[PDB]
Amino acid sequence: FWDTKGDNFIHDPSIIKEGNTWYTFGTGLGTGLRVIKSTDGRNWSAAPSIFPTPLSWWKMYVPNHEPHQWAPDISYYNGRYWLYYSVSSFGSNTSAIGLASTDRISSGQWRDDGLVIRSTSGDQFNAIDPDLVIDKDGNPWLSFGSFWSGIKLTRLDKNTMKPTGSLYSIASRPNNGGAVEAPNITYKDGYYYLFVSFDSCCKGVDSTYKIAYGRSTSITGPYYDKSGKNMMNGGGTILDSGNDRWKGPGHQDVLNNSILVRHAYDALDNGVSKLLINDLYWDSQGWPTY
Ligand SMILES: [Ca+2]
Ligand SMILES: [Ca+2]
Numbered sequence: 513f514w515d516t517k518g519d520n521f522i523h524d525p526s527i528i529k530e531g532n533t534w535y536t537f538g539t540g541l542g543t544g545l546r547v548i549k550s551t552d553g554r555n556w557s558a559a560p561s562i563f564p565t566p567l568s569w570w571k572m573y574v575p576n577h578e579p580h581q582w583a584p585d586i587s588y589y590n591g592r593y594w595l596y597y598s599v600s601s602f603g604s605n606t607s608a609i610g611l612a613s614t615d616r617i618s619s620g621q622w623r624d625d626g627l628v629i630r631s632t633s634g635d636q637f638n639a640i641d642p643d644l645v646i647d648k649d650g651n652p653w654l655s656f657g658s659f660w661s662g663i664k665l666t667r668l669d670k671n672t673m674k675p676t677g678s679l680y681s682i683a684s685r686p687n688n689g690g691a692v693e694a695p696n697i698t699y700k701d702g703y704y705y706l707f708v709s710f711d712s713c714c715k716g717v718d719s720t721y722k723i724a725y726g727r728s729t730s731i732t733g734p735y736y737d738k739s740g741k742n743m744m745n746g747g748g749t750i751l752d753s754g755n756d757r758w759k760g761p762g763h764q765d766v767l768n769n770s771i772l773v774r775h776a777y778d779a780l781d782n783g784v785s786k787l788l789i790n791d792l793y794w795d796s797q798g799w800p801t802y
Pocket of ligand 1: 525526583585641642694695764
């Protein structure tokens with residue numbers, strides 16, 4: 513992989529790259545959303561955090577929300593950067609996905625685009641871990657979810673960048689406690705590739721966190737394994753389960769179909785989650801490999 517050094521602490525990362533500068537958006541350290549920058553991709557340094565003061569309407573839909581926001585997603589589309597983020601409490605269902613936007617990340621000025629989708633105690637999903645994906649035809653979609661019924665997918669309209677239509681279930685894990693979250697979808701050579709994270713995430717060195725993927729000819733279509741197992745029945749070919757140094761990799765994201773970023777727990781540093789970046793390749797069958 514890319515050996516990350518310096519201020520390489522991150523959790524639930526999403527990579528982007530404006531000009532020659534890499535930007536990793538992550539779960540906030542303290543309050544808001546954490547951002548770290550890099551000129552070469554290997555040395556990272558701290559960057560101004562998003563939402564230093566909590567937004568007012570967060571208290572409306574997630575009143576008990578933790579001061580730090582979770583799992584951001586950053587991408588450029590239709591001439592503007594889109595930043596989806598989560599507002600929630602841990603192990604809780606009262607969650608809400610918000611949206612921030614800017615024309616240029618280096619300006620540091622983000623517009624408040626409002627609530628995207630909410631989840632309450634009555635709902636069977638969790639509105640965290642968002643991820644934007646653009647169709648082969650160029651239309652936006654949002655995949656999200658964490659435990660409960662699992663991963664949900666909805667179509668976004670180009671105007672509001674907010675959900676329209678109905679929610680589509682694309683990955684579930686009923687025989688393993690629904691332990692699936694952090695979805696990200698990408699299109700490449702006719703197939704959509706849904707990456708997800710399996711099992712438990714916040715146990716540090718001892719956390720059981722995996723990265724599994726699946727393919728489907730349709731964005732909402734049945735996602736399958738190399739074995740042919742539907743991701744709605746726990747299907748997931750494991751791309752990374754960890755090594756002796758990095759334990760419990762997860763909350764991954766892919767950039768430009770060539771870079772998979774990921775947070776892993778450093779066994780040589782008391783299990784603090786660091787940033788792990790890999791060039792993502794594809795085998796003879798188009799499946800993602802390192
Ligand atoms: Ca994500
Ligand atoms: Ca993404």
